[PDB]
Every structure is written in structure tokens, then in C-alpha cells.
Design a protein around this ligand. Structure first.
Ligand SMILES: O=C(O)[C@H](O)c1cccc(Cl)c1
Length: 279
């Protein structure tokens, strides 16, 4: 399948070169997979989600996304226009309040929730969790992400936005999950992207168009935007049968575009997520 006039990041993940604007992908499109978006919520009523999104858990007075961040990330995973995996099922877990803030204890509870809740969902092709959040190093936060991964969920986490080594942030620094840095449309490391040995992969993160609350759209930047590209890619590849939740991060690294990004510090992987789709 070909989506013309796609957001640059979608075009990038199906291309061997920057500077194109059509997204190419297998029509299976993540059907039969599920992606949890652990964030500020999801505006599931947005037409872009086509009934495939739902809130399953909140720790606050509402499950609605009063911020936009979680809706944007969910749109990059799986919206019809802005999403990588256009037929996946999206499940929202609201661990962040409407200002985008949340306590680590709530975030940990949300990760353990997903590890159990997947047993209440139909995801025959596999389960992914996208965590566009983080803070300072916490062994307990890292352990929660490790448990979620161990339980059979492909965990993708944002590297962080401090232009610093991600070893000092969580869950970014957990070795067993997929830690995602950000790139721009010219294949440069995004100016804010964290780096370091703990990164596994880069995805599009600067000037990413996606869904927003109020049935709207907007372009924003962050490792929060790169992470759902990788989460959606994992769901797509699992539906194709090319990989599994346990192996998807390594498979994405194996099959990435290699050596194409600029301003990658010595010792950080130079790997850009790529679907290897041959139309
Ligand atoms: O840069 C920040 O805001 C935080 O350090 C951070 C760390 C890890 C992941 C995210 Cl999305 C944010």
C-alpha cells in the first residue's frame, strides 16, 4: 500500500533515503496486534482512530486526554493518516495528568497493569507498549519496564530530551526495553535527543504531525514522538510474522537503516527504524 502526502516520518520509516513523502507498507497494517499508549490518555472519539482506540485505565478523575500528548503519540502509532500501524488496536492507560505530569509509583502501577491487562484483550499477533515519558534514574521504574517486557510485551520507551546520556533517565536506561532516540527530516539527530550506549534505535522525532485533542492535528517534537513510530513499527512487523515481542527491538535494529544519521556521538548506535517494505 502507498499513502501519498504522508507525514515525513512515515515516509522516512519506509525509505532508504530522506526527502520523500509517500509511506509504503503491507496492507495487513498491524491488524490483530495491540498497542498500549501509557501517557495522558487518548481522545478515542477522534475520527482518525476509526473506533480502534479505547481507554482501558486511568489513575485520575477522568480517562480523557486533557493535554493532547497521549493523543498525538497514539496517532503516530495507529491513526489512519498519521499512524505507522493503521489497523492496530490502541489501548490508553492514563498515568499522566492533564499537565503531563505523573508520579513514578503511578507509572509503575500502569506498567504492571498492562502486563496483566493484555490477558483481557484479543491480540493474536502480539502486544506492544509505548512509553513516551520518563524522569531521573530509578531502579524501580526500570524494573517495572523490565517486567512488562518479560511478560511478553514489546516495550518502547523515549530516550529523553536533555541532549544528554540516557543512562541517567528511566525507563530509558533499562537495558531490556527498546530505547528510542529522535531524528529530523534531514537525517540529523534531533537537537534535544538524548544519546548513549543504552539507545537501541532512532525514529522520526522533530516536527511530527499527528492527532490532537478537540478532533484536531498539530506538529510537535520530542523523543516522545519517535517512540510511537517504533512501537507502531513493532506492531506492524509482529502482524507480518517477522518478529515477536521478545525479539522485535533487536529485529528493528538488525533491519534498520545504518550509518545514515548525522551528529550521532561516538558510542551511540547509528540506526534509523525502517520497515524494509518492498512494494
Ligand atoms: O527530557 C525530559 O523531559 C526527561 O528527562 C525525559 C526522560 C525520558 C523520557 C522522556 Cl519523554 C523525558
Amino acid at each position: 500500500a502507498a499513502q501519498t502526502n504522508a507525514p515525513w516520518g512515515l515516509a522516512r520509516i519506509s525509505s532508504t533515503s530522506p526527502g520523500t513523502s509517500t509511506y509504503y507498507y503491507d496492507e495487513s497494517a498491524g491488524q490483530g496486534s495491540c498497542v498500549y499508549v501509557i501517557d495522558t490518555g487518548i481522545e478515542a472519539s477522534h475520527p482518525e482512530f476509526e473506533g480502534r482506540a479505547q481507554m482501558v485505565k486511568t489513575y485520575y478523575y477522568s480517562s480523557r486526554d486533557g493535554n493532547g500528548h497521549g493523543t498525538h503519540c497514539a496517532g503516530t502509532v495507529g491513526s489512519r493518516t498519521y499512524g505507522v500501524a493503521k489497523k492496530t488496536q490502541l489501548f490508553g492507560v492514563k498515568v499522566l495528568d492533564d499537565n503531563g505530569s505523573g508520579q513514578y509509583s503511578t507509572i509503575i502501577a500502569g506498567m504492571d497493569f498492562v502486563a496483566s491487562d493484555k490477558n483481557n484483550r484479543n491480540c493474536p499477533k502480539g502486544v506492544v507498549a509505548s512509553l513516551s515519558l520518563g524522569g531521573g534514574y530509578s531502579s524501580s521504574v526500570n524494573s517495572a519496564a523490565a517486567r512488562l517486557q518479560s511478560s511478553g510485551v514489546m516495550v518502547a520507551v523515549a530516550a529523553g530530551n536533555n541532549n544528554a546520556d540516557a543512562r541517567n533517565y528511566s525507563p530509558a536506561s533499562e537495558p531490556s526495553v527498546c530505547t528510542v532516540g529522535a531524528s529530523d527530516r534531514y537525517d540529523r539527530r534531533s537537537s534535544f535527543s538524548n544519546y548513549g550506549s543504552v539507545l537501541d534505535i532512532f525514529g522520526p522525532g522533530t516536527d511530527i504531525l499527528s492527532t490532537w485533542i478537540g478532533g484536531s492535528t498539530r506538529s510537535i517534537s520530542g523523543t516522545s514522538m519517535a517512540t510511537p513510530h517504533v512501537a507502531g513499527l513493532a506492531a506492524y512487523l509482529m502482524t507480518l510474522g517477522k518478529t515477536t515481542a521478545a525479539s522485535a527491538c533487536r529485529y528493528i535494529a538488525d533491519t534498520a537503516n545504518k550509518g545514515d544519521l548525522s551528529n550521532i556521538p561516538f558510542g551511540t548506535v547509528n540506526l534509523l527504524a525502517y520497515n524494509n517494505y518492498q512494494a
